[PDB]
């Protein structure tokens, strides 16, 4: 599933469902900036959770609340690598469903995605 707005593409967003009793989960998506100018992912809007923390290379233990995207760049995400932490989850659809959220890019604007809800220990897709 690809989403696109402006020169931004978001490929195959998916998340690990939170473990029973837990309120955090990891989300993974390929973000591509095909513009000759930088962009910034500055917000993730959802009624499902309070906030997000981006963990991106280099220094994956450090977090940030936006992602600066250089021109002609991408962020690849997977378990053990770059990822988004969804923080203070109040509700999440079942495994096999999707979670609706809106991404806000400073230049490209807003796109609503449906991130696939995968098993809590899923490694792909």
59 marked as part of a ligand binding site: yes
Buried residues in 36-64 as b, exposed as e (16+ CB within 10 A): eeebebebbebebbeebebbbeeeeeeee
Which residues share a beta bridge with 60?
A: none
12 marked as part of a ligand binding site: yes
β-pairing verdict for 8-16 and 109-118: parallel
Answer left, alpha or beta for residue 23, where phi above 0 means left and psi between -120 and 50 means alpha.
Answer: alpha
Residue 26 and residue 83 in contact, taking contact as beta carbons nearer than 8 Å: yes
124 marked as part of a ligand binding site: no
20 marked as part of a ligand binding site: no
Q: Which residues are annotated as a binding site?
A: 1, 12, 55, 59, 83, 85
Q: Which residues are annotated as a binding site for Cu(2+)?
A: 1, 12
Q: Which residues are annotated as a binding site for Zn(2+)?
A: 55, 59, 83, 85
């Amino acid at each position: 599933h690809e989403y696109a707005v402006g020169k931004i593409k978001i490929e195959h967003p998916w998340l690990r469902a939170p473990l029973e009793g837990e309120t955090r989960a990891q989300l993974y998506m390929l973000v591509v900036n095909s513009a000759d100018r930088p962009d910034r992912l500055i917000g993730v809007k959802s009624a499902d959770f309070r906030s997000v923390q981006f963990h991106i290379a280099p220094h994956l233990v450090a977090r940030e609340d936006a992602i600066y995207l250089p021109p002609l760049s991408r962020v690849t995400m997977a378990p053990g690598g770059s990822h988004v932490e969804l923080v203070d989850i109040s509700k999440m659809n079942p495994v096999g469903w999707a979670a609706e959220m809106t991404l806000v890019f400073e230049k490209a604007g807003e796109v609503t995605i449906d991130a696939a809800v995968e098993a809590p220990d899923a490694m792909h897709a």
